[PDB]
């Protein structure tokens, strides 16, 4: 099945900080790579933390690049990999929206993926959505320079 919405939202908050702080929190190889500056986009690491924390851990042998935390659990560090991981583990999406706007997702909650153009470091973003706002809205820099092409929601119960 799937992480409960409430547990996922709680866990996300624990890592809704700067990438430096995320490294301190998670430690292990996650921390080492963050200290070294190799990881700067916390997006997939926060989603990995959510899965690990809610009883749906990323398997060691999942076909995606990952590093261990101090918890000896595994953290995917590429956005594209996190997106593909969810596609292959979460079952059928509940909503798929072409040219999405936030208003299209009102009233439903869970894990949201948006793919689009305009960002120089990624093809998209993966986060939690509570029916009104994203869990990292506080970091969401921007009608911004990012133009969403497709938005996908997996409902969390």
């Amino acid at each position: 099945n799937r992480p409960s919405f409430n547990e996922a939202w709680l866990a996300f908050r624990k890592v809704n900080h700067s990438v430096a702080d995320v490294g301190s929190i998670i430690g292990g190889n996650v921390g080492k790579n963050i200290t070294g500056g190799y990881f700067q986009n916390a997006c997939p690491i926060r989603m990995s933390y959510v899965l690990n924390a809610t009883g749906f851990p990323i398997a060691r042998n999942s076909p995606y690049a990952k590093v261990s935390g101090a918890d000896n659990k595994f953290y995917i560090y590429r956005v594209n990999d996190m997106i593909d991981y969810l596609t292959h583990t979460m079952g059928k999406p509940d909503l798929i929206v072409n040219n999405p706007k936030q208003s299209d997702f009102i009233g439903k909650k869970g894990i949201i993926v948006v793919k689009g153009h305009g960002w120089s470091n990624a093809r998209g973003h993966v986060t939690l959505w509570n029916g009104s706002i994203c869990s990292d809205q506080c970091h969401l820099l921007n009608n911004g320079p990012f133009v969403p092409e497709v938005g996908t929601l997996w409902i969390l119960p």
Binding site: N33, G36, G37, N41, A65, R78, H117, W119, S120
Partner: protein, 101 residues
């Protein structure tokens, strides 16, 4: 404007990573270092390689970042260390050897 990041081949991404990472090492100013780190992270995102290849690129970068360069004008020539680095034969062989194409 979206950058050209998605247009680079896997080898080109690794060379781009090498250059931006080295610049992140040699420069003191936080705004510049953070910019070079952010830029390197973009090339890492699109790579299909495990993190240890970037750790090894860093090992080679450090052979250049620790050099002392001198001239007849006042400068540490930090930028030059990274330009010399990206021509390094060991670096280019490492990338060409890679297990993850």
């Amino acid at each position: 404007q979206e950058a050209l990041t998605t247009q680079y081949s896997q080898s080109e991404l690794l060379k781009n990573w090498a250059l931006s990472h080295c610049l992140a090492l040699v420069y003191k100013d936080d705004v510049v270092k953070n910019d070079a780190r952010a830029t390197a992270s973009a090339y890492l995102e699109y790579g299909k390689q495990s993190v240890e290849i970037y750790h090894e690129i860093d090992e080679i970068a450090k052979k250049y970042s620790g050099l002392k360069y001198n001239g007849s004008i006042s400068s540490d020539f930090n930028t030059m260390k990274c330009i010399d680095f990206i021509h390094d034969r060991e670096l280019n062989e490492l990338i060409k050897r890679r297990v993850e194409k």
